[PDB]
Amino acid sequence: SLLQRQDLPYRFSAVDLDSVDGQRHYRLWLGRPLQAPPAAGYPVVWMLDGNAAVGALDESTLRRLADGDAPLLVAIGYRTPLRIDRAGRTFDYTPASPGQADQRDPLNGLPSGGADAFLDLLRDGMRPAVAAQAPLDTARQTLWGHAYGGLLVLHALFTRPGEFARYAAASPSLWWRDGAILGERAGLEQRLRGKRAELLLWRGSAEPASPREPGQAMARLVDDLRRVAGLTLDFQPLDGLGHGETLGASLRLLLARPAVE
Ligand SMILES: O=C(N[C@@H](CO)C(=O)O)c1cccc(O)c1O
Ligand SMILES: [Fe+3]
């Protein structure tokens, strides 16, 4: 319903692209404020699982976002009949395992390891297409994701910091490949030299540790990252919520934060 609606201070339009290999099909939903852009361009919020993200963007949030410094919203979705692509997101949101050649997801068995190709496409194809539709302030960009989307967000921050000002990971799948993402954090302070980033983290109080000790891995990660120079960290636990529900909750709360400086 939201994408057709005409009563909000945002208008949504679609920008379509394929992956470089031709196997995955994207539709970016662009939400542009009626408000004129600042001289330096709109700040930008990029959202993974874009078809689900659009379903969570409520009217009250969107009215308040039009506050004189409203962001451009870019929801990166799959352009499929079903409006999901389990294979596509499994490949696009997971890092490669240097260990071996068996790049298959340990849970669902589908090909994995496409995170760097996905982030390269965002940089080299998606942003070019979005910037042609609306002026962007490239110093004021946010990347948000939930679950495997949050895994991709942490991969981006940990291995290629500086592409975004603010990283936002909701219920990231820290269990993935027995904690492999936690290894990628080693070396971050060196990679952040001369740069600044903000990381927002959420987890629901009712979530298990994995889909098959709850909270422990996140608590350890938070404790570690609080020590990292150049990184501003904000962890928000979500009392009363389980795994599915932290998607909408995190996005509402993100969009209520002060805009990136
Ligand atoms: O990370 C989870 N699921 C992912 C699929 O592997 C996802 O991306 O949601 C996950 C975590 C805790 C509990 C769950 O039921 C769950 O699906
Ligand atoms: Fe689950």
From Swiss-Prot:
- Is Transferase tagged as a keyword? no
Q: Where is the active site?
A: A147 (charge relay system), E207 (charge relay system), H243 (charge relay system)
May I have one GO cellular component term? periplasmic space
Q: What induces it?
A: Expression is induced by the presence of enterobactin in bacterial environment.
Instruction: Spell out the SUPFAM superfamilies in the cross-references.
Output: alpha/beta-Hydrolases
Q: Which UniProt keywords apply?
A: Hydrolase, Periplasm, Serine esterase, Signal
Q: What is its EC number?
A: 3.1.1.108
Recorded catalytic activity of this chain's protein: Fe(III)-enterobactin + 3 H2O + H(+) = Fe(III)-[N-(2,3-dihydroxybenzoyl)-L-serine] + 2 N-(2,3-dihydroxybenzoyl)-L-serine; Fe(III)-enterobactin + H2O = Fe(III)-[N-(2,3-dihydroxybenzoyl)-L-serine]3 + H(+); Fe(III)-[N-(2,3-dihydroxybenzoyl)-L-serine]3 + H2O + H(+) = Fe(III)-[N-(2,3-dihydroxybenzoyl)-L-serine]2 + N-(2,3-dihydroxybenzoyl)-L-serine; Fe(III)-[N-(2,3-dihydroxybenzoyl)-L-serine]2 + H2O + H(+) = Fe(III)-[N-(2,3-dihydroxybenzoyl)-L-serine] + N-(2,3-dihydroxybenzoyl)-L-serine
Q: Name one GO molecular function term.
A: carboxylic ester hydrolase activity
Q: Where in the cell is it found?
A: Periplasm
Loss of this gene results in the following: Deletion of the gene strongly inhibits Fe uptake via enterobactin.
Q: What is the protein's quaternary organization?
A: Monomer.
Q: Which family, according to the similarity comment?
A: Belongs to the esterase D family.
This chain's protein is named Iron(III) enterobactin esterase
* Native species: Pseudomonas aeruginosa (strain ATCC 15692 / DSM 22644 / CIP 104116 / JCM 14847 / LMG 12228 / 1C / PRS 101 / PAO1)
The lineage, from the top, is: Bacteria, Pseudomonadati, Pseudomonadota, Gammaproteobacteria, Pseudomonadales
